[model samples]
Target: GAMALKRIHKELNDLARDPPAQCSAGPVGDDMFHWQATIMGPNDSPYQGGVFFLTIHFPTDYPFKPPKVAFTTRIYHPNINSNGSICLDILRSQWGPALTISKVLLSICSLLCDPNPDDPLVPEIARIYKTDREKYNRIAREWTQKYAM
Candidate 1:
């Protein structure tokens, strides 16, 4: 329907007016369905000092269906895969039309602050995050600095 394009445009501009503290996203060029996204590592997380980039592709039935988002910058996190696919629930079956782009971005920022170790994309990272937290943080910080500077 026309709602996808209209609402996407609404979000594209509204998302910019009062963007999240750690993230921002907008449509790319004239394509309303494709977007460029960015996330600044949260100050209190091991991901601090990192600037992570991402890509968003809205489905033709967006609002009814969640957009596809993948990190363009590598991140060392339990719930995020090496290839940047996120293992977040809302991006999947839990998604609903009521959720907006801004809310999704904010949730992504919060995920950086607090990861879901129980449901991990990388089991080793989950183990490190649990038993050897300091080591986990150090590795995450190193990767952040190396790739997200």
Candidate 2:
């Protein structure tokens, strides 16, 4: 319908005109509904110096309904799982029509900076993150070096 395409076009132009720091996004090929994104790991986080990739897909009802976003680059974090599914509230119940992909990527950066061990997507990673912070950092760094850097 007119609603979805109009807002998506507006968003695309908004991103092209004023991009955010350490993040970039655009449509994949000619498919306006499908997109690819990148997020540089937060400097203060254990995953620093990493370049994380993600995929985005806008539903036909987008803005009214949240977009689908998931990591394509492997990352070691409690909030992100092996399958690259992110356990973020905005991707699910907390989603709002006012939200945009730019804000979502920023939220992911914040999550990478400070993972939530309590409500984790991967329990093992969460356990290590909570009980052995150093170990978590070490392993996260290892994964970043191996997979992202």
Candidate 3:
């Protein structure tokens, strides 16, 4: 508990000192282990001009195990489900101790820009992304405008 707290404090301080681009995060209420974050849509993506919110729960053994992060803002994407759970490799088997929440948020931003339809959480969205990209972009943009504006 002591070690984890110390590490979490350090990370929090770092974030305050040098926040990541298009992403901001901080602890929720007095719980250093739980955080709320926001990610601004990156340029050149359907998600652009949107503001997405997400929640984060750091495990007791964080930095070793990946943190749990889920979108609070609804989005239309191939790698994200209706419930906002993400289908990213690093959040599962590809996790590494060196990875930080800042890196994770950036990865999500990249995912928003270029979804991995081959390994998607929403198969219907994936099909559209693969076969009808223009339609996919259009719907994604619509959802972004509706929910993320």
Candidate 4:
């Protein structure tokens, strides 16, 4: 019955034992079901010099279902929405029990460095990403400093 929570506890242990380069997340409160996550901006990318925060709400059905994840801070990117939703496939249809928190955070970090403009959450940003990459990078960096710093 508590298998989902059990998986999370194991994930926390493994994550703590071997932290990744740019992201971190853990339970946000006394409740194991809620978590707060953070991702450091990737180097050599528009999102550099920023620290992005995220909200995670895991259901008791986790390990069998994907956890709900969203940005709590504003970020400017083609794959991310201004209102805080994400366009990652794993957060939706690609989810599987084999995926873990560490992997999710790493994928999010990679997304920062390489946004999936073709599947944009914000069309305007994606337009810039494709048609005017420099401008896209500039705006993204500016937004990162203005909001994420």
Worst 10 residues of 3 by lDDT: 1-10
RMSD of 4: 0.9
Clash list (residue pairs), candidate 1: none
Give per-residue CA lDDT, model 1, range 80-113, as digits (tens).
9989999888999899988888888888898888
Candidate achieving higher lDDT, 2 or 4: 2
Error of 3 at 128 (Å): 0.9
Give the local distance difference test score of model 1: 0.90
Task: Please provide, for model 2 over 114-140, each residue's C-alpha lDDT reduced to its tens digit, 9 standing for 90 to 100.
Answer: 889999899999999999999999999
lDDT per prediction?
Answer: 0.90, 0.91, 0.91, 0.88
Candidate 1 regions exceeding 4 Å error are: none
Candidate 4: C-alpha lDDT:
0.88
Q: Residue 76: error of model 1 in Å? A: 0.2
TM-score of model number 3: 0.96
lDDT of 1 at 45: 88
- Candidate 3 C-alpha lDDT tens digits along 39-107: 998878898999999999999998899999999999999999989899999999999888888889889
